[PDB]
Design a protein around this ligand. Structure first.
Ligand SMILES: [Zn+2]
Ligand SMILES: [Zn+2]
Ligand SMILES: [Zn+2]
Ligand SMILES: [Zn+2]
Lengths: 264, 264, 264, 264
């Protein structure tokens, strides 16, 4: 009776479904898949990428960047929501093939450096190739590329280094406040009395408040269904999208119900 | 007219003044210098070191460990207050010569990994040999060695990863609550509108509250004069030491006065 | 038509077959599986581990160490043949649970740090949790633990940082020269004109010569079948084992035949 | 009687003497100081920098890049001879301010990562801010930027990761083979029986042979005086420069004389 075989991170079919670039604002594009958000922001001095999806999406992301006229060497910076395998997967390969730099906070940087291994909740079950962050980001720090300013908003919970990004784009000249907020879920976590995360509940409750106050005219999430996006319908993709208030309220109601049956 | 010569980190004379081990409790010893705190905690399964002082103190710390019957291979773990040159200096050398592991939080880990360079306030002016943290610590996490439990209390401000450590020792059998709190000073910092640390003031104000509530019968600081310790007088070294309440109150009054004349 | 699912590193059944500690010399023990070598060397100042096998073998290795009276904190050092998943797999977990240090050369250190990803030949196909080396080793450097001296012999080829380890043990008082030589195979490699390894052939030919000259009375390999070991038969396990000369000769004949049909 | 003060790395006056860009070929420029070589290579897809000099030269290098029409974001790649403080000094700062990537071999990468500390010969005496290599380079590997191909030639000795770089430029249309060879000196090293570098002599002797065979019409060294360059005279700077044969021959004669009086 030997030891078990290693089992790989298998995801739903719609997470790996390629899609053509979908426009969000004058310079913001969804270039990921139907169920995974990968945002491209084109400026006069280069492109910015927010998240990348699964590790095997590196080639697809470069094809869609090429469809927008963005050569690999034009990618200047990669920003992250959190350093899990389904959102930072191809970061290591994208650095090698584009020469871009990665900016993240300290908690995301150390988790990224070990490829998601020794996760506080998942252990070594969901890993990916390691990557190193080039610039360390503080809460409220502004990152400017080509005139577009990105502001980091720490929201610890789903991971200690979970981060929301806000920036102002335009819609045919008129401004729009875009907010890319991270997950507020706890899929299978031990909430109360967790030895690896003693203040997990306090961090979550504060993040709910942080997301409510975010300056936002249009909300996007790493998983589009969390904010009621439907990338498949194209022009009507943002029709039923949620507000920052509604998104945070629904997350707290699910978090409270999960916390209630954990005591049971 | 050439470029200026590199200038080294020169400190006061009493920071580099060797002293013999001074006893604090049944298992807690000050083995640093007169003006730099380096705490040794002896257990049944090995020794724990909290801070190390200046980089050139590595040999002195091993001599004092030897005076307590602690061989180098008996040092199991190094804990840190914050990763500045005058307190984490010899950590890299101590790892090589003892085989100990280093535990710190993510912010201290990334600053330790780059030897204090690119400091948020000091730049590259005060550097030291880099060292890597082996175990990443969360706020409120308990670290146990030989039955003695160490609890981490995050107190960001002096550095983003500043940390206070609490543990219970004994004084001839009766328990005593020891608290090793980090610095609450801002020597030359830009407090308001700092681009590298946008929420510096909010972090400081919360840390003042954190230090007030710490479970503490006896307070020690990385610089002994900050808590009114005088290591030179030996038996009367703790006579005039401050409480956690008094230490936090004096720090906030100096921080408020500095913040008031910064607006001027 | 979506993107393919990630597939995990599946190995043969006998690679994951637990076995009880088998004695090799007075202080050298095989504590891995039937088809994966993990050598434990017990000294008066602690234990040394050479290789660890697959990532899921961490718990089994600690059980066998416990069977020899070796507590986890007694493991002082981990040495490696090469940093592939089937031999350095559990190194990251073993560091966390034992407080041991890892010593390897620069090439093995950088491959270990990225968990085997971006392999020169395998890419990201065979990964494992990353680990950092604590001490960097030069060719011919001696590592001493508890009086037993380990000498490193660089043999680049299978990986750039492939290393052979030699040390002298005893067999009921009389000395024996043990040599733990790495793999000399090229499973599916592109030998000629490889852009990632331009001098692959020159490195292999020199390693064949290095293994022939190794001081060796008894040869062991990471895969026991390569040196004609049969861990399953216990007392007769070393009966048919090869010499350093025979092992290197057979490797060069297979390497030359593979190089001949690559030109075809 | 306290512990000694830290002393900084003070160099000669001519090492920190700024100079205007001096042309070497159609695309190769010396933009360092009079006694420190920093080579800029301009291509159609960006610029390449070879070495940077002392840490305090970062601002000067960007001024000279600006004089050639090279914006910071146009710097694509930094190559290194060896990772000592007087040649890799400003690499960490240049990465932050340009978004360039660093390519080096494994030995240079690990020394660069610890800021030159724990040097095999100098210890912690000559340190600098740490930097991480983005791409790991093998011996004989070709690095292409904008059509210009750079070939790495390992020459261990001065440091284990010492590297020579060769590329073909033009002189008003006609080709010229440029070779940037590292130092072949051993300033104060222990050559025979060195525990940190057991095969130091063998590595040096092989490097002398490597430098003799380098394809070279024009030789440059990190210290210009080693190859008889005089950057101060401008147009006649290369008049008395040495060949690869003469440079290697003089290094071996000085190495043999030093090795002879070490036995004394
Ligand atoms: Zn996640
Ligand atoms: Zn400080
Ligand atoms: Zn292998
Ligand atoms: Zn040098």
């Amino acid at each position: 009776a030997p030891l078990p075989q290693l089992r790989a991170y298998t995801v739903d079919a719609s997470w790996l479904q390629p899609m053509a670039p979908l426009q969000v604002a004058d310079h913001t594009w969804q270039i990921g898949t139907e169920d995974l958000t990968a945002l491209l922001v084109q400026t006069a001095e280069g492109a910015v990428l927010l998240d990348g999806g699964m590790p095997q999406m590196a080639g697809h992301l470069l094809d869609n960047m090429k469809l927008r006229g963005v050569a690999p060497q034009d990618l200047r910076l990669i920003l992250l929501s959190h350093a899990h395998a389904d959102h930072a997967g191809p970061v290591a390969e994208l650095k090698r093939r584009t020469g871009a730099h990665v900016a993240a906070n300290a908690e995301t940087a150390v988790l990224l450096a070990r490829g998601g291994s020794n996760d506080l909740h998942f252990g070594d079950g969901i890993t990916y190739p390691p990557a190193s962050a080039d610039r360390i980001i503080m809460d409220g720090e502004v990152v400017t590329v080509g005139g577009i300013a990105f502001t980091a908003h720490f929201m610890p919970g789903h991971t200690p280094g979970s981060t929301a990004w806000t920036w102002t784009d335009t819609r045919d000249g008129k401004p729009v406040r875009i907010a890319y907020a991270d997950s507020l879920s706890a899929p299978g976590y031990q909430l109360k009395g967790n030895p690896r995360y003693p203040r997990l509940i306090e961090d979550y409750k504060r993040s709910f408040a942080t997301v409510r106050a975010l300056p936002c005219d249009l909300l996007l999430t790493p998983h589009p269904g969390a904010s009621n996006w439907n990338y498949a319908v194209g022009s009507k993709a943002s029709a039923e999208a949620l507000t920052c208030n509604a998104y945070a309220d629904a997350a707290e109601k699910k978090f409270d119900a999960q916390l209630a049956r954990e005591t049971a």
